[PDB]
Amino acid sequence: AQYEDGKQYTTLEKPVAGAPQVLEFFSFFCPHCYQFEEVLHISDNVKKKLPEGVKMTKYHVNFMGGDLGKDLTQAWAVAMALGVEDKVTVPLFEGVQKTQTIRSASDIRDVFINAGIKGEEYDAAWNSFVVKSLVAQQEKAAADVQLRGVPAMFVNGKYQLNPQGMDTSNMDVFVQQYADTVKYLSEK
Numbered sequence: 001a002q003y004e005d006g007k008q009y010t011t012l013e014k015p016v017a018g019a020p021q022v023l024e025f026f027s028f029f030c031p032h033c034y035q036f037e038e039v040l041h042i043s044d045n046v047k048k049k050l051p052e053g054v055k056m057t058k059y060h061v062n063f064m065g066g067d068l069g070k071d072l073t074q075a076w077a078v079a080m081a082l083g084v085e086d087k088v089t090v091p092l093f094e095g096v097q098k099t100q101t102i103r104s105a106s107d108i109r110d111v112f113i114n115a116g117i118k119g120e121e122y123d124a125a126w127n128s129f130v131v132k133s134l135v136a137q138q139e140k141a142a143a144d145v146q147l148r149g150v151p152a153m154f155v156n157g158k159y160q161l162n163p164q165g166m167d168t169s170n171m172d173v174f175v176q177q178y179a180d181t182v183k184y185l186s187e188k
């Protein structure tokens with residue numbers, strides 16, 4: 001058919017009840033994730049085509065980058081809690097992969113300070129139980145699908161995007177095929 005299980009998406013054999021409608025996972029250590037976000041703008045283009053009433057959730061993962069990877073999951077929790085994802089995503093990706101200036105939790109904190117988050121505000125969030133809970137929520141969602149690779153996107157706990165089955169000769173066409181597939185899946 002036009003959209004086929006095994007081509008543009010795969011189907012989870014253990015569907016996850018109560019999962020977010022559209023769930024993206026990434027790591028700031030993940031090279032394809034840098035491409036998805038900084039070059040292809042996958043999340044934004046998926047969001048822009050989602051049906052009314054379908055919201056997007058994006059979570060960081062621990063399994064890349066050891067200690068610093070876990071610090072980045074916690075910092076992503078701070079970003080979600082403060083609502084500053086759109087201020088820190090670019091400098092976190094560039095700090096880890098472009099300039100390689102993020103080597104410690106303090107260096108992560110510097111990105112937030114430079115982005116205008118006050119030091120007391122960042123530190124209060126970093127140490128908060130609201131943020132511990134958001135870390136737990138990120139870990140649980142990844143565990144629910146036994147996640148071992150990023151980038152990854154899941155729709156309604158049932159379907160997983162399969163970008164490896166899409167033509168990569170034109171970036172723009174690839175992005176809208178991916179977004180159109182997410183829309184299709186959300187309408188199933």
Ligand SMILES: O=C1CCCCN1Cc1cccc(-c2ccsc2)c1
Nearest residue numbers: 032035163164167168169170171174
């Ligand atoms: O290599 C793959 C195979 C599957 C799709 C995800 N990626 C990562 C990627 C990174 C940067 C650009 C592109 C791309 C798309 C269309 S033209 C160029 C693709």
